[PDB]
């Protein structure tokens, strides 16, 4: 991926995370839990479904017959038709192959992006309270009960509340 998170500095995904696309597995004095980030998850889903709508939006054009499956048309004009149709088939086969490859690349990078967006947000919440691991993990110096970790998930975590103690715990 372009943003270096998925299949990147995050070594692998979680099969236990069935609740969303992106989430947190915490660890503390009270033990391990897990959850899902709705906001991030929904932003990928809504973008992805936006692509789908776009490619299912096909009010098509009418085409009629110009040849005859029961009573072959005159041969000259038959070969011109077949040449044209085969040329159009080639264009569309190319177009479809390119569209999906082009789209699939973006999808993969787009999901990679959203993970990185969530990551950096969190980093931005814990100003000098936590430090970076590198596996996709924030080691917290001050302690955090299940109330703390839920405060981070809710965007309510206050860095100034636990500042001095974590700072010194360095």
């Amino acid at each position: 991926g372009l943003f270096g998170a998925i299949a990147g500095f995050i070594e692998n995904g979680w099969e236990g995370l069935i609740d969303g696309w992106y989430g947190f597995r915490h660890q503390n004095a009270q033990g391990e839990g897990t959850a899902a980030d709705y906001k991030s998850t929904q932003s990928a889903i809504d973008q992805i479904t936006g692509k789908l709508n776009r490619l299912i939006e096909k009010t098509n054009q009418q085409f009629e017959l110009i040849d005859n499956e029961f009573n072959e048309v005159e041969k000259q004009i038959g070969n011109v038709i077949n040449w044209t149709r085969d040329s159009i088939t080639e264009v569309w086969s190319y177009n479809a192959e390119l569209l999906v490859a082009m789209e699939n690349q973006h999808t993969i990078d787009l999901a990679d992006s959203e993970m990185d967006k969530l990551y950096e947000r969190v980093k931005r919440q814990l100003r000098e309270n936590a430090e970076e691991d590198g596996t996709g993990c924030f080691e917290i110096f001050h302690k955090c009960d299940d109330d703390c970790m839920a405060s981070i998930r809710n965007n309510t975590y206050d860095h100034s509340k636990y500042r001095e103690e974590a700072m010194q715990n360095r």
Binding site: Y22, K58, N71, S93, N95, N104, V122, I152
Partner: protein
């Protein structure tokens, strides 16, 4: 002491292709090329005419198998393999152009030409055209000389299209089994048939001789046609070997025409048709038949092109 971030994953991922890779596994994908056919003509909500044994062109001239189709009306027109444009062996000049016209006509409405004859017989028939006894094309009249070997009076007949849309006009040239048999019907000497519309000129000289037996008969009839515009007049100058139009046809509106060998079905609706059935799909592309008509996904050579609907899968 810590809070890790991660993403979901699955034991069973779906492989897809990108700009950079082939077979990269993602969480979930969905197909974009349609392969599913309904093996029926899905005709729900459409005025449909299944021609069966009637040939589309036979609706204009009217051999017995087209008696019930002489003034039909349709949004959808279905041609069958078994369909036949003729009873007495014959062929249409420009057959396929006239088909394309009739396929999108919305059907036809006939109007009497008002031709009236004096000095010739007009009730000619044949065993090939059966209406409980020998007969002929319903919309046509087989013109002759009153008695065997008699002359044919040089004849000038005209029709003015007085209506607002153009009239499809059709006449037939006869080709008898012998040079002797053309003389019997219409007298000896070489006969001439010609046609003159304000935007059309052509001429027709008969060509007797021995063809092979079709429907038991070895003669042939050439059918011909032109569209005659509003307030224009068509003139028929002739001396024999001529099959005369009795009614002129007019096109009703719009339709679509297809060729098939599957059943009709008013329970399903579709707008993309081929000979094997109906493509009901919202997918942008299809790999079923490149000659499908109506409103269809674009045909593509590829059997499948999977579109990622989820992030890359990274298990274990």
């Amino acid at each position: 002491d810590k809070i890790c971030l991660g993403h979901h994953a699955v034991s069973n991922g779906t492989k897809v292709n990108t700009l950079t890779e082939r077979g990269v596994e993602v969480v979930n994908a969905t197909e974009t090329v349609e392969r599913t056919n309904i093996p029926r003509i899905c005709s729900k909500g459409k005025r449909t005419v299944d021609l069966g044994q009637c040939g589309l062109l036979g609706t204009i001239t009217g051999p017995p198998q087209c008696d019930q189709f002489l003034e039909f009306s349709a949004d959808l027109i279905i041609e069958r393999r078994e369909g036949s444009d003729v009873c007495y062996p014959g062929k249409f000049v420009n057959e396929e152009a006239l088909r394309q016209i009739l396929r999108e006509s919305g059907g036809i409405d006939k109007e009497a030409m008002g031709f009236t004859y004096s000095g010739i017989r007009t009730n000619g028939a044949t065993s090939a055209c059966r209406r409980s006894g020998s007969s002929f094309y319903a919309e046509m009249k087989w013109l002759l000389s009153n008695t065997d070997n008699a002359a044919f009076p040089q004849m000038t007949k005209s029709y003015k299209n007085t209506r607002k849309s153009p009239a499809l006009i059709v006449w037939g040239i006869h080709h008898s089994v012998s040079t002797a048999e053309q003389t019997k019907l219409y007298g000896s000497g070489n006969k001439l048939v010609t046609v003159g519309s304000s935007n059309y000129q052509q001429s027709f000289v008969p060509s007797p001789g021995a063809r092979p037996q079709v429907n038991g008969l070895s003669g042939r009839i050439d059918f011909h046609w032109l569209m005659l515009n509003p307030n224009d007049t068509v003139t028929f100058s002739f001396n024999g070997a001529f099959i005369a139009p009795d009614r002129a046809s007019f096109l009703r509106g719009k339709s679509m025409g297809i060729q098939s060998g599957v059943q009709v079905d008013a329970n399903c609706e579709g707008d993309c048709y081929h000979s094997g059935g109906t493509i009901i799909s919202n997918l942008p592309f299809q790999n079923i038949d490149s000659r499908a008509v109506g409103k269809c996904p674009r045909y593509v050579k590829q059997r499948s092109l999977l579109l990622a609907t989820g992030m890359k899968n990274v298990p274990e």
